[PDB]
Amino acid sequence: GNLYSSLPLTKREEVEKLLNGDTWRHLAGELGYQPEHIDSFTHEACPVRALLASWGAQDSATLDALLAALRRIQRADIVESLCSE
């Protein structure tokens, strides 16, 4: 689809509300980042902030990619918000 970082605005900060301080980890691994990066992402300024900047620099880091990895961990609650809210 379109990228995740394609949203340049505070709707991504509204994803810090959604991709909450737990399930983002689970997703991070399922998004092909090694566990060392998942750990460095909770050390970096905030996970979801440096996550949507860094994952959102990778090839097919589309909204529909992140949504798929979420729906794979059945965290479809975040996905349906991601769909709009």
Swiss-Prot record:
It is found in: Cell membrane; Cytoplasm; Perikaryon; Cell projection, Growth cone. Homodimer; disulfide-linked. Heterodimer with SORCS2. The extracellular domains of the heterodimer bind NGF. The cytoplasmic region of the heterodimer binds TRIO. NGF binding mediates dissociation of TRIO from the receptor complex. Interacts with RTN4R. Interacts with TRAF2, TRAF4 and TRAF6. Interacts with PTPN13 and RANBP9. Interacts through TRAF6 with SQSTM1 which bridges NGFR to NTRK1. Interacts with BEX1. Interacts with BEX3. Interacts with KIDINS220 and NTRK1. Can form a ternary complex with NTRK1 and KIDINS220 and this complex is affected by the expression levels of KIDINS220. Low affinity receptor which can bind to NGF, BDNF, NTF3, and NTF4. Forms a heterodimeric receptor with SORCS2 that binds the precursor forms of NGF, BDNF and NTF3 with high affinity, and has much lower affinity for mature NGF and BDNF. In response to proNGF binding, the heterodimeric receptor with SORCS2 activates a signaling cascade that leads to decreased Rac activity, reorganization of the actin cytoskeleton and neuronal growth cone collapse. Plays an important role in differentiation and survival of specific neuronal populations during development. Subject to intramembrane proteolytic cleavage by the gamma-secretase complex, giving rise to an intracellular fragment that is rapidly degraded via the proteasome. N- and O-glycosylated. Residues 21-85 form the Death domain. Death domain is responsible for interaction with RANBP9. It also mediates interaction with ARHGDIA and RIPK2. It comes from the Eukaryota. This is Tumor necrosis factor receptor superfamily member 16.
